[model samples]
Target: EGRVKNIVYLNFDGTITGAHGKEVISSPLCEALSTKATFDERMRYKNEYDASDNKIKITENAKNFLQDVNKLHPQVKIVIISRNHENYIKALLEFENIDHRNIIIYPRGVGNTIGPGEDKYKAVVSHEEKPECLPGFRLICDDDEVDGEEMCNGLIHTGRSQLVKFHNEKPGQFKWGEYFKEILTNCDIAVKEYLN
Candidate 1:
């Protein structure tokens, strides 16, 4: 069988890191999804919030995960997609000392946008429309159920793609660790098969 071309779309806030300085550490899951696949980290933040001390650190687990993914899958495409300033994202990643040299940052269309709310949907839709984004082999992991539903809508029935959602139902209640681990198990199987 031929290698499966996989594209893994990640939601930056809540999914990988907290939305606004919240902690959601799960590097194992991040690493597993990034292995041998296009690792895309999608983020959205206001440009005005870009302060001098506004440095964001990739979770220790997440940093290690990216490193491991690169060490193992050198050909894997690691990308950062966000509506925030590209310069800020790049600088923050570099400042955090995360090996992002092999990582591609897509701002504006690849990650950034001019407006709010709809930008996330637009990002997903636009990326999906890309010729290289082969259908049925894509996976999107996000924390917004409503957005996830909207994003995964037409694609889910086709079985060409899948959506993994993470969110908190109540105050101080986060379930991504469990959800990510569960999804990672299956993703790991698929990624391993694709790499081999």
Candidate 2:
């Protein structure tokens, strides 16, 4: 049998896209909400993201990180696990032009079932448990603090699991072009570590 491969479960909103706390709470409805915003709260309203959603800044190195994964070994599975509305995520990818055709997305509803932090855990488990990926495989969950820890806590003991928390790269750094260049390279090494 081939060496065990990886199923990289990724998060979208804050993890994939840059923090929009400023943009999010800028509305009359607005900073308290933005300051307190959680991963699932960003898309709570159906009309949340206007046509300008696609134009927002992406997480630093997000596009390059994804594209690099797209070119990784065939056994690698790039799966997107998101709490954002299905249409919202789809729109970003479509407009952003990610090499996402081969990638899989678990966005808000699977089997048409409606949405957690654990929901993301379930999504990762769902794919991890898929027949062909069975026996066992490595799980790499990449997300911001809350969801990433939840995912790692939920699945860590179940098998080989790892968490790459994005915000940890450089605490208090949210500005574009300000994120540490070091995080992506560390993840690149982590992913290849298992494939070896």
Q: TM-score winner among the candidates? A: 2
Q: Which candidate achieves the best lDDT against the true structure?
A: 2
Local accuracy of candidate 1 as per-residue lDDT tens digits, 81-178: 44444444444454455666766554432233353223555555565555554533444555566555644653554344554332323222344345
TM-score of 2: 0.58
For candidate 1, what is the total of clashing residue pairs? 6
How many clashes (backbone atoms < 3 Å, residues ≥3 apart in a chain or on different chains) does model 2 have? Answer: 0
Cα lDDT over the full model 1: 0.43
Clashing pairs in 1: 82-111, 82-112, 83-111, 83-112, 108-112, 136-160
User: Each prediction's TM-score against the native?
Assistant: 0.51, 0.58
Model 1: how far residue 139 lies from native, Å: 3.9
Each prediction's number of clashing residue pairs: 6, 0
lDDT by residue (1-196, candidate 2, tens digit) is 3432455566665556654323432343222222323334534432434333543444436776666666664545677776654545554554455666778877654335675322766665666555555333343434356666655654554554543333322222333233223333344644454455
TM-score of 1: 0.51
